[PDB]
Amino acid sequence: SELLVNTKSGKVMGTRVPVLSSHISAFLGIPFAEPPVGNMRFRRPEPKKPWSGVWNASTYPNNCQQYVDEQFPGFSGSEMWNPNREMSEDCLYLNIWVPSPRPKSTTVMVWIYGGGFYSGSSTLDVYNGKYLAYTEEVVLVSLSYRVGAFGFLALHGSQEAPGNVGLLDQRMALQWVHDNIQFFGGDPKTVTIFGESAGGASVGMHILSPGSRDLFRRAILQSGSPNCPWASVSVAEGRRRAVELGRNLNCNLNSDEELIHCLREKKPQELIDVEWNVLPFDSIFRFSFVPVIDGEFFPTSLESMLNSGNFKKTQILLGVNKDEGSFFLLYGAPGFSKDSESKISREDFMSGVKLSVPHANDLGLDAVTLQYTDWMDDNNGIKNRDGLDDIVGDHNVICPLMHFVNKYTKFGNGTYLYFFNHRASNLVWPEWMGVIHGYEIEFVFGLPLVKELNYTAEEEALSRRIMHYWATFAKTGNPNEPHSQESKWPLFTTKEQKFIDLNTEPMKVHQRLRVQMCVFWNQFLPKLLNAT
């Protein structure tokens, strides 16, 4: 039977699903690690023990225990990101969408969801692999990993909560795809991992980490890179937050064993209730528990790894959205509202700059303000709003990703950069937010192809273009069709630094994606803060 597959872990029974008036197979909720419950909390994942009989993989698995957004109850715009399944510490499962008839050895794509390392589910609607699997004829795998304290608590030196266990979770899923995807029709020697936000940072981290390099062929990073200011902490800050977390739940703090044991007796929702209290600064776009440079997963510091060429050399395709920042200002900066044009005054502008660059002294806060203020029109509410929006995106996503793409390209074997700047016609968020963080995803998974979702004809056209780029790239290491007549997505080179825009208009190539600001955030500011 086409829905029955025999893996090295046991037999699995999938289900047939309809897609764009046709069908494909779907094996949902296949386990890849032992349930990290009880004494296993905070600990590294262990391989799932083989099973007898047939595992029923016809329904989605549970979602990792996480923080849930309730800023806008009912609002689809924010709930489409919340977990749509029972939350449980028994979360480590993966989903596979296989074409029909089953391929013999086709290209594999493994998706890693984003969410600031504190949230995310593989089961959201926007992450439905069937449209992409079907349309491009690829095996689509979607894994899951532990988030928040559960996946990133870090008491270095201890084997009870080493840290990065959330990344080990992902590696585990990748190890399984490597050892079994062949039985699903996939070709293990041609697996592309691709992510978004924290998932984009995760992809970049497997490229840097020696232990994961041999488990994939290529990579796609969307709106996120490993060296982002929010994606990692030092073991010292990791330890500082581990303790403070324990201090909020009134736990014995005399020793790591003391602390860890107390944290293991707490109900999942109790760690999550106080999780946001450990941040060192009043900030925006920063998260409590994230990866930590431990000396294991990451040999040395990220910057020295990027400078020494110490990382997997292959091809990569990455890019960013036009307005990456707006989403975080809405939720945390004074002045912004989902229901108003949110024009910002001088006072609120500067409050925002303080919240965006939390680690900067008064001199730095001034450098940022001077760099983002048009003194001929300083009290223009629309300019202060869009200026603040730019600061958050540049410092947190764009300028960091450009530093990565530039350091990488010097040792890589091919780079392709994009700039997604198209606002979907059916977006429910206000206009001032623009091309929002994470909304390019729907085009990657092809939601525009399903009529009922209400997308324009050109938006469906854009979705197919992108799906063919990602898929053609996953297969060949080049997003372009061999002998096509269409426009060629030029290659990014240290010299030219070309890139293309991604929207419903005739392709246009450009150069030096936001150089003016990227030099400020990557060269000047760092230097200034270090001298002062």
Added chain:
Amino acid sequence: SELLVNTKSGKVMGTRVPVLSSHISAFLGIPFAEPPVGNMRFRRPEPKKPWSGVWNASTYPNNCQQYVDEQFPGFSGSEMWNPNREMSEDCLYLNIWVPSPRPKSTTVMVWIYGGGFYSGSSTLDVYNGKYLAYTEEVVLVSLSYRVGAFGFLALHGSQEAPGNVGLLDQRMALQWVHDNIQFFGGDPKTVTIFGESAGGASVGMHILSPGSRDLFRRAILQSGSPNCPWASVSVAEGRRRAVELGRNLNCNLNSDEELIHCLREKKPQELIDVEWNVLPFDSIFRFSFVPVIDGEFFPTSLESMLNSGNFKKTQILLGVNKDEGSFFLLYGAPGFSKDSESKISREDFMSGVKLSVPHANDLGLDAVTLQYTDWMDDNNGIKNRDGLDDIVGDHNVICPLMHFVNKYTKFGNGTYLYFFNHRASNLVWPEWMGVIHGYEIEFVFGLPLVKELNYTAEEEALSRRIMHYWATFAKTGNPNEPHSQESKWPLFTTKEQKFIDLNTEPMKVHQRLRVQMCVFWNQFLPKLLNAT
């Protein structure tokens, strides 16, 4: 006789001179102080002792002993600024151009030449007061003062070379105009002093100094203000340079008397031969001997005086030229040539930035470079050239003058700002230099009215407009004609900050003259250098 005038110092015999096919009186070389020779060198000026008989004031006086430019022998462009008379330490004289018939009580204008405080003569061709006196019917006075070591050597605490004796020279001339201009037809209660470059800085200094405030009614400052980074030094740096000067001439340095006496035995040309060796840094737009904040001429520091409203409150009219910097880059920065387009490379650009902001640490040099570099086109030779040109002008003339006009306007009784951006059609300097430092002067003195000089019809029209503005302002405190139909030069206010352009095109009002950069040079950079 109309050419004979009896002053409080003695009788003076002037001469009749032709102007624009007509005539006026001219009393040239009237003395106002005792010859500062011998033991009087470096010392404060003493009033000229009355004389019997008639002083012959029909020919120009000598020029102060100064450094002479020989960078371009023969070139009119640079020689029209060199002394056109025998140089001598016996230099303190003034020139008066009086209308015919002699006025009973008309408006007076006293001109103070510029020259970096190290050069300048009142007898240059471009400073011929007859055209202006004639055309606007005003008494035009032109004084002279000691420059270089001779007028600014400063060994604070000693009465042999107190410092600022060059400014005392100017004050002396003003005291005489105040006590005698009435006998020439002038009205002493309506004297406007106006200068350019070092002279613009001098005008601003009489506005700040308690001792000179009561000697004039209004003021005009062109391309220069008292708080310019090159216009003054601390008593410590003044003392440091005084000594080093003495060290170059092998003088006994055991005591001030020791030093001063040795310097008084040296021929004038020997101090000038080594004068440029005392500058503390390899620099551009900086001069050896300049005014010094001594606590006498200047009660306290300039910045605190400007903040406390401690200065003469009246009306002022000031402005700058579009390309104030080019002239100094030509003479001192690597890459520029009088005969080439002078396109600058990245290396020479940065060499230039080092030469322009000599007092900045490596962090500052980077802030300046980042602020003046278009990273989308970093190797554009024309952009690096014009960028360097902007740095020199902004930091040395424009941003400092805007700081003055803003601090002043808060306590003044009327401010009028202009921006001269017209390049004369007969300029002999290369095009890349643009609207050069000091070339607005020719329009102020009306050289365009004399055909033989080869100016366009619109340039002569511009010259008359400016001459009427300066003159109408000197008389009324407003450059505008009471009930005119012409365009009104709006008033500058703390709120609006309006200003006008000055060229052969229909007047256009603007706002915030170069705010973006003025904030960098007046607020951020200062602060950065202080914290680091």
